[PDB]
Design a protein around this ligand. Structure first.
Ligand SMILES: CCn1c(=O)[nH]c(=O)c2c1nc(Cc1cn3cc(C)sc3n1)n2Cc1ccc(-c2ccn(C)n2)cc1
Ligand SMILES: CCn1c(=O)[nH]c(=O)c2c1nc(Cc1cn3cc(C)sc3n1)n2Cc1ccc(-c2ccn(C)n2)cc1
Ligand SMILES: CCn1c(=O)[nH]c(=O)c2c1nc(Cc1cn3cc(C)sc3n1)n2Cc1ccc(-c2ccn(C)n2)cc1
Ligand SMILES: CCn1c(=O)[nH]c(=O)c2c1nc(Cc1cn3cc(C)sc3n1)n2Cc1ccc(-c2ccn(C)n2)cc1
Ligand SMILES: [Fe+3]
Ligand SMILES: [Fe+3]
Ligand SMILES: [Fe+3]
Ligand SMILES: [Fe+3]
Lengths: 342, 334, 334, 342
């Protein structure tokens, strides 16, 4: 009972979403908009929209300004020039889909509500507007429910190519195309599940893993290095450098990787590569065993809650469930022999 | 290639099934023009519902509410004595969160949000009778189609499903995770099945859900929604025919709309469901179905790639079983 | 801690079960002193067998061989007509490799090496009657205890199991992988069970293996070893009582040694086996059993560590299922 | 049908065992016994014993000479002085067991028949006396059946501390203690299974994996490096060097490791470490997927034969089997709740 609290059902996740340690309206001293009073009005308007968000209510639509829509446009064209050659297969497949259904156009900033309904249909993810920085415990808790917290504001127009903080541009062009991949979604959820009720030290390690994978991971496809890290896909300078010849690149291993330090400003010392998200997801699930907690967690996608496996009765039902599902596999194999003679 | 009859492949596609109403409309026997005034309203509301928007709240007339209270009192009298354990465990919960009170009419939106948390079911207001293919399709998504109107004259007599039947008969059992698994199983079975097979499922559905009994503690108790709704019949099933629930044998038997059934018993819902899945293989269709609760869609198992993807998932879920067992040894040495 | 009745935990420990013979010895009704001369020899041989050494080869007398030929001809007459598919598929194989000929007596060593390859069974020459606990324990290891002697006077009449019964009744079915799984399942169930449960298993064993029927192609055919051995009874079971094989109901029924049974049918051995495992849970013992075919020993599932170890193994085996499916898509695009 | 032959049932493995490319009686030019005619008589006697071996016959017992028994003794004492500190947990646990049941004593050379019956009871392995070098295809084929081919001769007495070829001492002190571990046994069998019907190029890679794992693998236990490689456990010079501070040590990965060259004479450039044999076994099984062959293989321990998974009917039975076995898991969990209230 000395285990740190975690949300046990989807509606409880609101406590995590609203425990904002640092609000978006709080610009850092070296922020390009630190003395822009027009920009703080927008920043505090977005914080208000996010703070008002509650479970069971559609994600508010926001009317973006012209200098926010071009700043988006600027980031949109420069990165599109490097996606065919720098992005993973999963990105390049889902990105045209976003143009068709989520309004990914240079002249249009996508709405989170659109993106949420799109992700739910493709991989079961849904986005939440967040009013600022969360504890890594609270942020990762969202992942356990396949909920990604998104900033809804646009970076400053002074320098649209580089931002030290997350902005909607980063969320939409960096994270969302990959969250649309079912295999990637499972991988993200595994990190979340692992954090639930974990120690602060373990949460930080998971947060580190999140950083070097979700934000800055590379992946090897057909003998080539492509970026899937969202931070890479939203920073052209880093994106080009990551796949550059003079870069230190190491294989992704949860136990090794998690001990390294994360650099907010300078380019990272090393970038980690995963063969596949299924491959990375299983390395997370074996890392999750080493994490200290009195129980295991099962996620119930039907009730959108967390099952605690602390006895044989709940473990058996899970196993019984797996037995039924294996029966369906047999049915499928039967039908296939039945219809194709194989 | 789609020789097989169409079924919704995404939760959003289920709207097509709900609105395809064969019969909204009253018979001579049914009782009042003012009552008709309210019913057309109720139908209009059900027709106006589409996926993703909250189920409309309705201000009931006192006349509807008094009738609701009557059935509420009569049924409650014999629930400890004749209803299954699941009903009795879930009924007090309905009182605290869904406004289940003799003086009040519970709203579908309250009940829907209640069921989603308890078992992943959600209710839909329906505008009338649906084809058995369409009605069962909802079950595949754990969606129960509910009439939102009240029975007119005689409170105890009901010739058609009304919200009293839906709320007092179905909902307490829809709250049980295993019953939820069982109902969904029938729906999954129906998807893309021949009309012949679908009806056999409708019969199975009828005996099992509308009128099923299940032994617990060695004692005969009713779980049939029709039975919960109707007292005379409820008292009668327990009182001195009883047969074991076997889907293949049960489907053969007819349903009499007016007269009392010549009744099926299941040890458990886990039991029933298994007998259901084993029944589903005999059902003619080129594919098997897997349900994706994350995307709320139907996976079609027609190739090896889709089948493997399930198996890999199952491998992972088994790793979690292993993790649980390690931890359990870790903390209890057992 | 071992309150439960002892069972062999390693293949080598099974020697203790084989040699604990309750009754080696002939009744008044049984027929000849010269015959007794040979039988004591046969018992001496069975007693002399220990684990790991080849089953002794025996030079049969012509008298034993002529009798063997007689039963061989009579049974063969009705095998296409009354025996199951598995029997008929396996009998020609026995002719080519085990010396199954009207003029010859097959040796246990030939048959044993035959069964090991086909289904993992091996036969043991037994010195007499064993306790049902001991006899069924052999099945847990896929070991069938066989008498090595021949029936004396009347060839068709047999009051006790002899090698003719063992070779013509049991062996063709012991060669089928699924029947093998089913027989082992009964043995596993018995390990450490109460005497009460063991006997119920002995009854189940009797109706199923000694005297079971199974439908194939919609047609009634016999798989019961007793039936295969005895023609009069074999003809009679097919001819106009029949009941479905359910272990819990079947065990209740008695076995008449002399008279004809008042007979159980199984759709398949896979079917029967499942009903067996589901029966095994009700059997009182503090543990579950897992069989290790690599070390030929019994795993006792009493803690989480042993249970996990199985689950991890099962995870790996599922990976192989996945590999197969990939390759199948790889080569056939399916 | 253009797939290279592999044994499909246990009795067929004899073809592999007897396809000796180079007999033990054929001493290499720099062999210490190359001009020892007394030693060639023994070497050719052992070859004869091995050549006469057939399936279903007890492994012949051999009466060793006095200078073979001390040479054994010599190797036996020097290595025992380093096992507590250089060997893995699995080795140190099984080694005293070998002393009790297999006659592992300084004054006694163990018989293969003893060792075989011991291994069968503990992990399902059995040893075969081999008359010499086999093709890697033939050697690895044995592993698929959990059969290890063993030399039965003793190294030359001139220099008992170092041998460039396998001798009974190596088999008994290097391989057997680890083959007694069920987890290790599964790992060895996985390598074998992978080779069955594989291309020559893939077989060589598997043989390379065998080399750097079975013969020269290290393992990390409780934060320390211990050797489990059989070649390490039979060579004191290499054994000390492997755990020495100035050694290049890398993690065991099948895809990476398999491309490296194996050095017969000089100490290896790098040594590979596995967290556990279960851990290594699963890396083999994922490597096995990448191996090109028209089918997958299932090993039937009941009939001791290989199942070919080329259709849905055989795949389903496997899945059905797994469903029954999962039912037993449920039974076990039921009983545990039933008796312990958990
Ligand atoms: C596991 C680490 N991790 C955490 O522990 N907690 C998080 O809240 C978190 C996070 N990671 C990300 C996402 C993120 C972080 N980050 C940094 C970039 C440069 S781009 C980018 N996206 N977030 C979301 C987030 C939301 C807001 C802020 C932020 C910073 C300054 N302001 C005003 N707001 C920073 C991060
Ligand atoms: C599988 C059979 N099955 C079907 O094929 N299709 C269904 O639509 C269906 C159903 N079963 C039930 C639920 C139901 C039907 N029913 C009859 C009672 C008397 S109580 C009761 N509950 N429904 C829902 C439903 C909805 C509306 C009506 C109806 C009847 C007359 N009106 C004007 N409306 C009847 C049934
Ligand atoms: C589960 C019941 N069951 C048991 O409890 N214990 C068993 O030993 C057993 C058995 N069942 C069978 C096999 C068998 C028994 N039996 C009787 C026939 C008539 S045909 C036939 N086959 N055996 C093997 C066996 C071995 C020897 C004798 C026997 C009888 C008289 N003698 C001198 N020897 C009888 C049976
Ligand atoms: C997968 C590689 N691999 C192969 O492809 N094929 C194998 O036959 C093999 C093997 N690996 C090992 C076992 C072995 C190899 N080896 C080298 C040491 C130095 S110690 C030691 N043990 N063997 C068994 C073996 C048996 C005999 C000899 C041999 C060498 C010279 N003579 C006269 N005999 C060499 C190896
Ligand atoms: Fe980010
Ligand atoms: Fe109903
Ligand atoms: Fe018998
Ligand atoms: Fe070696």
């Amino acid at each position: 009972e000395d285990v740190p609290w975690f949300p046990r059902k989807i509606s409880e996740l609101d406590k995590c979403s609203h425990r904002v340690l640092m609000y978006g309206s709080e610009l850092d001293a070296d922020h390009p908009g630190f003395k822009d009073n027009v920009y703080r009005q927008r920043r505090k308007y977005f914080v208000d929209v996010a703070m008002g968000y509650k479970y069971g209510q559609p994600i508010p639509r926001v009317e973006y300004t012209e200098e926010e829509t071009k700043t988006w446009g600027v980031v949109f064209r420069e990165l599109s020039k490097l996606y065919p050659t720098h992005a993973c297969r999963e990105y390049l497949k889902n990105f045209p889909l976003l143009t068709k259904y989520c309004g990914y156009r240079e002249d249009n900033v996508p709405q989170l509500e659109d993106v949420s309904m799109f992700l739910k249909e493709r991989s079961g993810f849904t986005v939440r507007p967040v009013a600022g920085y969360l504890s890594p415990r609270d942020f990762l808790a969202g992942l356990a429910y396949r909920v990604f917290h998104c900033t809804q504001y646009i970076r400053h127009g002074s320098d649209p190519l580089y931002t030290p903080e997350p902005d909607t541009c980063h969320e939409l062009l960096g994270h969302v195309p990959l969250l649309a991949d079912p295999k990637f979604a499972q991988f993200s959820q595994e990190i979340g599940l692992a954090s639930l009720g974990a120690s602060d030290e373990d949460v930080q390690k998971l947060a580190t893993c999140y950083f070097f994978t979700i934000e800055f991971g590379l992946c090897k496809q057909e003998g080539q290095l492509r970026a899937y890290g969202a931070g890479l896909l939203s920073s052209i300078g880093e994106l080009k450098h990551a796949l550059s010849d003079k870069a230190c690149v190491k294989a992704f291993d949860p136990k090794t990787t998690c001990l390294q330090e994360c650099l907010i400003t300078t380019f990272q010392e090393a970038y980690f590569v995963s063969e596949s998200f299924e491959e990375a997801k299983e390395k997370m699930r074996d890392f999750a065993k080493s994490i200290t907690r009195p129980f295991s967690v099962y996620f119930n996608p039907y009730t959108q809650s967390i099952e605690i496996l602390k006895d044989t009765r709940s473990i058996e039902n899970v196993v019984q469930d797996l037995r039924s599902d294996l029966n369906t596999v047999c049915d499928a194999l039967n039908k296939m022999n039945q219809y194709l003679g194989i």
